[PDB]
Symmetry: C5
Subunit: 307 residues, 5 copies
């Protein structure tokens, strides 16, 4: 098996689209192997640019096709270059733009922590014909940066493994195992914009919802409660386009559902207070003094939603 | 007829867009047949990569064109590979990305159950010239997964049939029947996000709409009813972009229309109560005690909308 | 002139985008003519697949280029095939996806009735060099179906005509007339979703707007009228993205403008009733008994907006 | 210099996107020049279709490349054709689809008046090597039509000029002047949809805002004013997506800002009336009789915003 | 090293998309170097158009590939041209459309000031094989213009530097340094549309929020405060799509958060005034005379948010 030595240079990560869990990676890939010696013009390496490589592949040069496994579409290959040396070794350099995809887990949404994965694999040659020796990843352009809201933490992890395929088992009986390269980059979401735009106003709205019990008139309490319900419905719409649509419940989601529960609890409490009159002559003191109990225990419910 | 043996490997299903009823499938297809024996370099199979196959087709190699019938556009074919054996058999491997389309029936919308269909067919050769022997489908990467809200249930069904075409009947009189492969995957929608985001708030709003009859003042009842109508109109907008636009009525749709009916029924009931005065001195007791009847029977109406 | 015999097979119509009045047609086109006899391998017809046809056109085969006149962009030609017979006749089969455009008249918008038109024409050869003999259209896959909200009614009309061009009159003096094929399919919009989503709620809102005159307090009437105006403004936004923007007035549009007129008429009537006091001691009876006149005549206005 | 005689045929103008000030033009271009005489098959002109022209350019035929200067992207060239005559003259016909751009001035927005410009220029040859003799424009398909809201008024103006370039001055010292063709089409916006959808409701809302002074209770006046402010905010959102975002102020914009000013003026006037009590015993007569002054002078302000 | 002399002509800058911080640049690039002398037809320079250059590169002409480093995608290269002179020098002219990206800092958002950067670099040749002599930038078409809201101030800065690469250090040990060209254009945002559309209405809403203390009834103050909170929530939605989502706080953002704080402060102040009764018989004078203190100090807070 011929030993290819990959080197990936990440130029920028951008376009992190949490709705579909894709992200666009731009960069360069440099593969390098050693073949039979050849005669080049002079004693110097020869550079073959894009759309000329095909004239060399037709004449019989061995250039393998490396593909990105987790790409959504096909990578927008820009320029490509092939450097041939007189001593025998070949270097294939190419520029890629891709929309890669990874399994993101938005369980802790504003305080999220994901990782961006590049998976690279030969398309045709198993590990008895092509083996990856090593990979370096030069992620120096995005070492400690803030792309839009993602801090790129630490270095980039690399790994070389062997993936066994089964749809090729009938056509390649006992040799259907392919060498694979994985590159992982840890990114932490910046929670500031959500903190001052989606959590502080919801906290103020929920506290104001608690503040309806200071009224001494029942009808005004009902109309006020419905106005607050309308405002919470406005935030129900206003948070819909932020993140995709998942079985479980995020942090902003808990605040929205807690706001709905607070509005409904206040409405039912004032209805029950209006119905609390046994003979219609008794007034209410203890159930309208929930201005200390209804907030505080609610905060404990918030603790249950946090931990 | 030459016997082709297809094998499809589904890599991921994603981008399930219910508005247009398309879905994107990414994967590999491996066709395989047997031709005349040939002399290859050594005693080993020969691999011909992408953009080299054309040099072999020009010289006279028989490679059929398989097409996907239910595709919206053209499949984004990435790499492709052709393995030729000395014993005679040929293997064509290719990678596809496609936006396929199927007839979806959103009658039970949050609790939906659809299936994703791949239909594959030769473009030029009828079943007297090309016949599909079998198909295996290796859907192991998405066996029991949750792509975004779709559980992929069970294995993948496969079928081989013969489709007879009529626009080719004048050009191919008695042989216009094409062999076809169908692949079906059963998927069940995950109803959780709609359950806690589109059904619980509508239930609370409808119950609060029932709660307007506890007021003892007519004008406040009217103004409260109009505020509730405004909130239900907000959810009328808020549910518009979820699913496409169909003649029949889904589950969230029934809740919205039931909310409109509840608001209008309450308005007409309080107007009729205000008009119920025969001489202007009589008050109302029985028609304002609908706080047990107006909810409960409405729930029975909900049963009619469920079953 | 050589006699081409076209046959079009419509596979599906979808993506009917009323904002730009385009629609996507997917299908196959089969042209067929007769040339000089030739020697094929054996006594059997010869099939030339895509990207091989060019080797036959370079050697001198006559294949005309048929274009779609009313296409927005260029048709996404998928596979194409060329069948050559020993007796002499040639058959060109191709698969197209196109975004076609037609002049749509949304005067009766929910109860609309449009037709989808395909116009096909040789690009280079006038009717002294290429003449269309006939066209069959095999629209059997969409014969009586419901694509999203369009019932496809009846069969597909076909027509063959001659279109005379003037920009080619200086370069082709007396022969600048091109044979053309037109295919028309009649489609009727399904009005159900608009009926239960855009007309019933507007009717309820307008009737509730009529219901403000039962109040006996002037200030509450004004505040109620402004709340109803806010709701009608919400539907003014909610109907904006449904259909494009036209000089005339559709059916939902009339309901929106009628709602605005009802709100303003009620406001002016209650202002005039408050000003109706000649000396400030007289009350109002007849002008507040418009609860029978203000609805009913409004319905007559609706008749004027219908017929 | 060789004399090219261009002839442009506009097929349709559509997709007029005022946000980016682009518009899509579809049509045909027919260039024509005279070269050396040649021998064609027979005594008849020879037609060379698309993807065959390259075989003639490789052998040495002179075909110039005409480009569109003001295009956003690259023109979607469909079919192209080359007619060669035995007497010597060559005719190049091509079909284009382009997204052209022009400097639009939306100062009078619903009653707008723009013009659509096509600029055509040789890419390589200056006017000492290629000169445009004349241009005809056959805009007969869109002569007096209504595309969506644009009336195409009159004929199409044409012009031939010489544009001098400076980045080519170092590489072409005294000959860097290129012949250019300009085509201008005058279009007038159809103001009807904005008239009945964005000006009549704003007029009704502003007049209703004037109508708050008829109330005799201060708190109800304040709450009514805030409800009207909420409605005007709804139209502030509802008008945002219509036209792009410009330093100056359009007609609908003036109505929105005037509505804000009316709400704030009414609020400040009722606050000042409540504070107008010198000793707390005096009531207000003259400042609450602004029901004739506050509308009328406002209309004069509208005149200032019109002229 | 061969000395290339680049000259860039910016035709238009448009599509400045602040959400992703890209901008589209359209223009021409003219590279020029000197090679060995050659024999051309006549004594005149020879022009080689697009799709003909490849026939010259195959025969052995040295044309380097210049790439744009900061491009999002691949530049839409339109026409390209190659002028070869008998004295020996070669001129490569090309037309580009690109979506370039730069690091934008929206700290002072309506009064912003960014710069647009073009970075150009050879793809294959280091500065021992290709060196940039100089660059001129002819930005005369956008010298002092207003594209949509960006004034292009002054001339265009140019710079030539050497960038050292590390992923090429293992394949090119001591020569991995590439010559680079940078072009910077200073642009200032036009703040007018935000001034009259996003700051004046927020100022009026905040001042009206201050105006709630003139009421003498507690329940009406609460309901009024909640209505104002609903309006501020409407502007919270209405400002979301203007600029991307950043850790820090812009100018409109400060106004929105200040509005929320004003609503909550007024609610807490009126609750504390209602609770201020020591025995329930005392009224409030000083804490309701904050109509001079609550605005004025708030303005000082605004100063803290400005400076
Ligand atoms: C003082 C009185 C208080 C008034 C009460 C006010 C009302 C307040 C809200 C109450 C309901 C609480 C619902 C909150 C939902 C909490 C959210 C939640 O449960 O999380 C997910 C389920 O979500 C969901 O099904 C959403 C469930 C919501 C559906 C509501 C059903 C509850 C019954 C309600 C009937 C009416 C009330 C009856 C009272 C008499 C589980 O994700 P899981 O980790 O498994 O990963 C998924 C896996 O697929 C990952 O691959
Ligand atoms: C106490 C008093 C109560 C107050 C009443 C409050 C008001 C409450 C709403 C009432 C109307 C109910 C409408 C609900 C509509 C239910 C939805 C429905 O019917 O389903 C679809 C029809 O939808 C539709 O046409 C929608 C129909 C709605 C149009 C409204 C017409 C009803 C008349 C209304 C005139 C005014 C009232 C008059 C009262 C005096 C049938 O799909 P189908 O399976 O065939 O597959 C289609 C096929 O093409 C698949 O290929
Ligand atoms: C009890 C008192 C009642 C209160 C009144 C309440 C208010 C209620 C609304 C009233 C205005 C009615 C406007 C309704 C507009 C009806 C819609 C309409 O007229 O249709 C189109 C014109 O639209 C339009 O210009 C829209 C016109 C609306 C502009 C408003 C101008 C009317 C004057 C208003 C000044 C203020 C009132 C003054 C009262 C003192 C004609 O398309 P047409 O077939 O030609 O094909 C086009 C061709 O280009 C196809 O190629
Ligand atoms: C009875 C009391 C009445 C209450 C008052 C109610 C409030 C009512 C509104 C008032 C403000 C009026 C603003 C209306 C703005 C009018 C719109 C306008 O002026 O047009 C553009 C400027 O826009 C703009 O800067 C918008 C300017 C608006 C910014 C507001 C500043 C005014 C000060 C406000 C401070 C608070 C008030 C203080 C009162 C004590 C000029 O384009 P120009 O042709 O140059 O081409 C551009 C070139 O770049 C083309 O290439
Ligand atoms: C009379 C009584 C008055 C009532 C009070 C009314 C309420 C009014 C609002 C108050 C909170 C103020 C928050 C305003 C936030 C100001 C905005 C701000 O601080 O700027 C950014 C932080 O944003 C942010 O974290 C947003 C922070 C907001 C989160 C809120 C936490 C504050 C605690 C609140 C708990 C409840 C109150 C408790 C009172 C008892 C810093 O960017 P920085 O330059 O570093 O570059 C980033 C780097 O990554 C660039 O690469």
């Amino acid at each position: 098996p011929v030993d290819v030595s990959v080197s990936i240079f990440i130029n920028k990560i951008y376009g992190v689209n949490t709705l579909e869990q894709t992200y666009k990676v731009d960069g360069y890939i440099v593969a390098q192997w050693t073949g039979k010696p050849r005669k080049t013009p002079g004693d110097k390496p020869l550079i073959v640019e894009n759309t000329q490589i095909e004239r060399w592949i037709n004449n019989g040069l061995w250039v393998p096709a490396l593909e990105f496994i987790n790409v959504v579409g096909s990578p927008d290959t820009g320029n490509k270059r092939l450097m041939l040396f007189p001593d025998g070794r070949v270097i294939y350099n190419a520029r890629f733009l891709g929309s890669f995809s990874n399994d993101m887990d938005f369980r802790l949404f504003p305080f999220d922590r994901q990782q961006f994965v590049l998976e690279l694999e030969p398309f045709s040659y198993n590990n008895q014909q092509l083996r990856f020796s090593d990979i370096q990843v030069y992620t120096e352009n995005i070492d400690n940066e803030e792309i839009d809201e993602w801090w790129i933490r630490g270095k980039a992890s690399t790994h070389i493994s062997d993936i066994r395929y089964d749809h090729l088992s009938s056509v390649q009986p006992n040799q259907n195992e392919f060498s694979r390269i994985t590159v992982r980059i840890d990114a932490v979401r910046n929670p500031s914009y959500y903190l001052w735009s989606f959590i502080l106003p919801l906290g103020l709205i929920i506290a104001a919802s608690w503040s309806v019990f200071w009224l001494e008139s029942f009808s005004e309490r009902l109309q006020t409660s419905f106005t607050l319900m309308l405002t919470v419905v406005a935030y129900a719409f206003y948070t819909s386009n932020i993140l995709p649509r998942l079985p479980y419940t995020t942090v902003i989601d808990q605040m929205i559902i807690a706001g709905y529960g607070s509005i409904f609890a206040a409405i039912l409490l004032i209805i029950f207070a209006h119905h609390r009159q046994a003979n219609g002559v008794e007034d209410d003191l203890l159930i309208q003094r929930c201005r200390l109990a209804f907030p505080l225990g609610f905060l404990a419910i918030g603790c249950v939603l946090v931990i």
